[model samples]
Target: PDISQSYWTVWGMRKNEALVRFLEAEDFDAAIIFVRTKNATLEVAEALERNGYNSAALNGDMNQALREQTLERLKDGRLDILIATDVAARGLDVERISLVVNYDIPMDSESYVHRIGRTGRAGRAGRALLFVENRERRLLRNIERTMKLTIPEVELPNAELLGKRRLEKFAAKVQQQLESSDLDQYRALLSKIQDLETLAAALLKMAQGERTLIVPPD
Candidate 1:
């Protein structure tokens, strides 16, 4: 039975931007992003990790052991994001996944239901965000009619607010590092530099480089 929940259609924006916005908007336990192909599943997962997300991918090509490992990591919270292909994601029943993202529209209407149903389970409210392109409007309509549900369109977060949210997330990460990481190497380097401001600037640049940060264009 379809319990009480919300579904949103996000359009009029680039796919990557929409994903970033959704992640920034929600403090979800786990999010599953569905893509059309296995290659995309791997590519997006790697890219998201480069962009600072603890992400993993699931596809048919992986052996059972690897697949189980990935799923277990996700279930135990070692990974909070998963990019998966349609067939590979079957029977995934993780209760902590509160959000499902349709990065690419499914080829059929039935798959649409299957993809979004990953969330909103077990007496807990869940949410789904579908990214629809102009040419795919008809597909969205078809899905709505089949499910007998109306999925409302939502505007992306305002630019300034989105940037602020990202900055806050980054600051939280930095704080986490400061609290837990060993800094003796950096401290030695700082002493060598003998200039606190310059060392700080260089360290920040290195951190940004290491993460390969991505930001929206102005």
Candidate 2:
């Protein structure tokens, strides 16, 4: 893969929420969500799992069998996101891993080459994403210098668009529930401001949770 092409930096407020959102929207069969340390791996794996993915971190702590099992899951279509550090994934070339993400960007340049090369593939159609924090600005600069190519920045998909699409789909489900399900028990519970629009709008935000439609511009 060309260093200048399909390489990008994502600028966002909250990384865990944003990364999950970005990965879901992108059309990847599988992915390598790379972290710089085992500690970073733990945090990322939990974040990914909590968002409904059954993900785990593979590192020095795991024995050979345990580590091998993790690899097998990805191989057999039992997994998608595999959070790992620099060591375990040195020569990993899993087929589901066409997308490479730097949740915590690599500490040096050699890793920058190997990580993207291993899972991201060496030919075409591999997209690599870097989450570069303010402190890692120089780190990003060093990689740019070493790779001899600029890492282009990218825009995250907006919940307004994401929300609008879901609203179209979910609104129908709400109608279906209206016709089929029991609602009077809870519906009568909150009887103060009984505006139908207000009740429906409240339920929408309640279900939306942290990835709200009212986010800052992408």
Candidate 3:
């Protein structure tokens, strides 16, 4: 299946989470994440790498030989991510990459497609994630119309939503383990605890101490 299809299948998944899951599942050899300029490339690459993703910057500022060397390393599986601008990424043919990230929307639709077309070759599935800003929605809509592709609107998980989603996901994992894992011994051990439900209640109570819960619909 293509990455887009895969994205739809993952439960409780948004764009960023989907991208992370897709990359983790495939253990991708390399990815080309496109930004708009030299400064943007550096900023994005550094942020991505800091988050445990192996990545480096590629832009017009780099020498031609260095650019070629970077692409070579990426192809040889020595690099996992390449952050680039349109100028530097124009004609790269790194075949090992299975994903691309458009960190900044390009000036036009053709460039958008070209940026993402770096992946999904030889019948292998590929994925791309476009990170467009609020102001670029109109441009993005235009690109979507031109490409005949449905670009779904994805809302980034804010801190509050992230916390709730994480907890929900963890609860699902606990449920899965309860059904699929051999944990009867653990269940028996659970009986030894002094009122497990009450302990949970106590813990929750302690956690909420002096903290005001956000009341419904703002």
Candidate 4:
């Protein structure tokens, strides 16, 4: 079948939600999310950080020192997610990376093989999750043919379940902050506020202003 170039399609799911859900589903020490361009790779990493995930970016344009530092952080478990472009992510020799996500389908089958090979190395089982849009079906088909295997399709979490997972992650962060950070300043301010819950809610709103939640659409 000829590869179609237009009319791309993906699930009705949001990209952020899909990324989070897949990360949660796979309990990996480190993972790589492969995008097609340098800008989007950096943007995805920044977005993850804004939403409380420890993430880093690697693109072809980045300096060697920064790339080395990024890989070092991932090796030591300081970073959980590494968003990278195809050519920039090659030869990443990390055994702890148990998962690789194809956020953007590769331009060719060779790229696909290289991206997935970053994981499942050193005699360890590795997994790859690919997000395919409709127009990319031909690319996906080509990949399957090259690999000579069928890629199973799995269901994404429902919206309600995704909402629960988001809240759970946020609550975990709140608990971690409460345990690890000094809260004397916040406590002193809250003492003067009559409605403590109101103040807390307002602060949370500000902190999460730029973060995406499963907010009810108008």
Superior by TM-score: candidate 1 or candidate 4: 1
Tell me which residue pairs clash in candidate 1. Answer: none
Q: What is the TM-score of each candidate against the true structure?
A: 0.74, 0.72, 0.61, 0.70
Of the two candidates 1 and 3, the one with more favorable lDDT, higher being better, is 1
Highest lDDT: which candidate? 1
Best by TM-score: 1
How would the candidate models be sorted by TM-score, starting from the highest?
1, 2, 4, 3
Cα lDDT tens digits for candidate 4, 83-120: 99877876577667877888898877788777878877
Query: Candidate 3 vs candidate 4: which has greater TM-score?
Result: 4
lDDT of each: 0.76, 0.73, 0.66, 0.73
- lDDT by residue (tens digit), candidate 2, 96-161: 667788887777888887777755454656777888777778988898899787777777766676
For model 4, state the Cα shift of residue 115 in Å.
0.9
Model 4 bad stretches (over 4 Å): 1-9, 163-218
1-218 in candidate 3: lDDT tens per residue?
A: 35551112223544344445344444456788777779978876666655568778898889789989988888787788988888987776887877787767767889877777788776677877676556677877788789788777543334455445445545675578669766787677656666678876665555442322331221
Per-candidate clashes come to 0, 1, 0, 1
TM-score, cand. 4 vs. native: 0.70
Q: Look at candidate 2 and tell me the lDDT of residue 97.
A: 69
